Symmetry: D3
Subunit: 173 residues, 6 copies
Amino acid sequence: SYNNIPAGKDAPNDIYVIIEIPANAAPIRYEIDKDSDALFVDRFMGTAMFYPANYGYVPNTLSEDGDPLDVLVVTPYPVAAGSVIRCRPVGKLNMEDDGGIDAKLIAVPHEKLSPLYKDVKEYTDLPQLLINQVEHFFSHYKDLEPGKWVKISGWEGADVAKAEVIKAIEAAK
Amino acid sequence: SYNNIPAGKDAPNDIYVIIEIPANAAPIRYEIDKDSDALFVDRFMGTAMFYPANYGYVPNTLSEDGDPLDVLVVTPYPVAAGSVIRCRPVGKLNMEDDGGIDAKLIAVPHEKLSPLYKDVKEYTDLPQLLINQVEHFFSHYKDLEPGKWVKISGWEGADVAKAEVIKAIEAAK
Amino acid sequence: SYNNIPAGKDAPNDIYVIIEIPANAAPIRYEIDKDSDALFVDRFMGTAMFYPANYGYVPNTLSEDGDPLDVLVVTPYPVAAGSVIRCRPVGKLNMEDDGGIDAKLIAVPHEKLSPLYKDVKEYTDLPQLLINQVEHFFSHYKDLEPGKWVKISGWEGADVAKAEVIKAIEAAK
Amino acid sequence: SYNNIPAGKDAPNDIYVIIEIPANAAPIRYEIDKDSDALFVDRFMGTAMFYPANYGYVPNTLSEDGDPLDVLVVTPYPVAAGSVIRCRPVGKLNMEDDGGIDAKLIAVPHEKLSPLYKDVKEYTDLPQLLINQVEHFFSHYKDLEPGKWVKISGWEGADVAKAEVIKAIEAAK
Amino acid sequence: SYNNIPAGKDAPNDIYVIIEIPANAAPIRYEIDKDSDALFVDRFMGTAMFYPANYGYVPNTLSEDGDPLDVLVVTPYPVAAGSVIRCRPVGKLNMEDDGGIDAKLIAVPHEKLSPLYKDVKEYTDLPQLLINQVEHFFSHYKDLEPGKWVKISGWEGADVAKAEVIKAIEAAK
Amino acid sequence: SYNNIPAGKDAPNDIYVIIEIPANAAPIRYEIDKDSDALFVDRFMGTAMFYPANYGYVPNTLSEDGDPLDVLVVTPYPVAAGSVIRCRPVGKLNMEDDGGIDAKLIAVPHEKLSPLYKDVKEYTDLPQLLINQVEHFFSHYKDLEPGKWVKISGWEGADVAKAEVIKAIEAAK
């Protein structure tokens, strides 16, 4: 049970993220059931696109999606599906979808995992093309799913990124 | 425990299949133990062949193999090992092996996973080469395993494919 | 030399396409120099997208924009970069570029290369999602390259594709 | 829980090994937590190196690392992460590290998994370059991790390789 | 040009092989044009099989069937398509085709390319399963291509392989 | 022909590099013949290491050791072997070989190829770990090839890299 994994070692700036879809992976949406812990294939993406970064969730949280809080982690090389990355939140990606709103945070590995992003304090420190690529992926990856839309709102800093994790931690209590 | 996963949402025409070997994967037979849920490597295949499609089993079933009922699912791109696909059975592949008989069903993803096979009602709707390739794989993939043989019998439709799942559901009760 | 290859053994029904970019490949736009026949790295794609079919051109052809005839070849597996596929046109995709009007043909392999695409004689015989991914790919793969933009106009039948081949072979060396 | 898996079927010469890092894999150290069973990313390796073989551990053991006994298995093709290989120990690789000593055994699949190494009785039967490559990997793969060193001591045979498993079996009792 | 390459620095012990199909590659039969030196897509394989060694030919040789000498080069890792391996023959595989009689040599890389195959001087020094996969691959990889069929006759020693090289170099340009 | 390509559109700021070995590729050292322009397999690497950047040379240049100018091109994704990257030098790596003194330039792609490396104007603008992996790779990738050894001397600025380009173009065809 992935519930055994804490939301981190020192939340907010130390979250664990269980990866469901690796970066640059096959065009397949995976989602982890929270009763069997198995990797469920949600949909074979219609668009000819791939995820710009690893995307998963923080364990033992709850937002207004009904499901835990979604995270996108940037790594030097994609991680295996079902893996847990000790990362640090550095931004929040707000956007409106068919069923209300959705909010993704962008994350980055920790001191002991990788020195690559010691200078990444907030999402603006990542390369501009990546941020532009992350926005472009979510706006268009569901363009062939009938009835489903996505519109990108704006970005928010790490301090508010590290805020929504604070509120999702006890919303699961 | 994969036993938490039901055999489906609306059996017969809505089975779940836990994939043990992805399509076009490395020449390695994986099998999921049903006590630890871990992915066990059964044998490194002697033949220079790969699985024509993802092959796994429906959870919480039982046939006359002693183990659950085996399924081959056709997907636009191979799924990760240990994943569960919400698919629909569309055929049955009968064949005789060293220890009696074995029966595989061919399956196909569902409305909400992929529109690719909305027109696939039975195995004859899949391309002929695939069916010919699935038969050729099982007939020859054990040609270098000493003492083991496989002979291909015939094909059966979805209605009888959806029959053996009916009988394997309660044979596990 | 590359232009030591005819446009087709029996054009326009039988044509050759040198492949410049493979399908499902890394997002690297390759274009083949004709002074040198070396593979030139033209663009590292900004958008998180991949080519839905192997992209290339017909040897010994000259289109309007000054270069040979663009062809997307649909194959069972992605072919190597710089390899020659013997194929047959089945449709034509029309668009307007930043430089004016553009057009990409779509083709399936020759009968002797694969039996998978024989009853595919028009582009509408191809899967409906594949046609939509080609439309979606070309409409958005330049979204993050500045100065470029693509507007999808509409498809034309297999007979017009063979006509544009005839006209491209016409004005060339 | 991987604890359900025995240390083998007939220890010593029949150990099970849960693979955490596949061979020739991405430069990523994985480690399996022994409370959640999840695949944890330990560190993104600084060196431009890959693991010469699959490396994991024997379940339900304990050495003087505090963690179970580490094993390197040689296979015809890399196994998926989180898989369990029925292998046979054929050597011991002693070496001193920043925190005391570490000891790895080299292993090899069994009769029923692969005939490739029926003649491999001890690590000297494997190709010399592999042994030289295994030594070179561990000596240098942490050259960019600050504060961490590794020095290679020597090799020991299967009989002593099959000894340390004997002592790690009951050290977990 | 490709035929600007000798059959070997010191034939028949030292030979060159241009590789047409890599090992463990996608099931695409490539053959290299000699008018053009471009890589031609000859066949999308029907059978779910892959080449057990990199397939190619010796430059500046002419066999009976009208084409250069077929050689399978066993390498630690699959080499790129269209690349030149400096290798040494160790055996000969004999068969009868639909067009008559055929023969494929098997070779291991030159000493300066790898120390892994030095004490391999006959094909029986290669692993016994590898010899059987080459026999099984050629006997079945054309099972689904109509009009073709291959019958394995038997192997011949390393000395006959060097003799066929001498005779192939003999009648050529 | 390959030497039908200039050293650069506007050397030394704009240069071309034919890539001989891609990044993160299989440990196969390729070198491009100039008699033939075919890709020659030079060495199957003994050490379990991979190239940290795509390795190649500048056309129409002549260095001291008799061959064109070595350049490592850092790219978002590894480019195909034998492809031409339009790039800009940002630093120089100096070393002493078994044959004397050696030097490898490091380069980032031209502005028109990617916006990711524009504010990279010196090699110290590249990530500090990447600089260390190139130093570590060249210092150890020949550890298991006998007769060879590499000693890292130190880096030099982007202005010296443009100077060595000028001198390499100078004494050449």
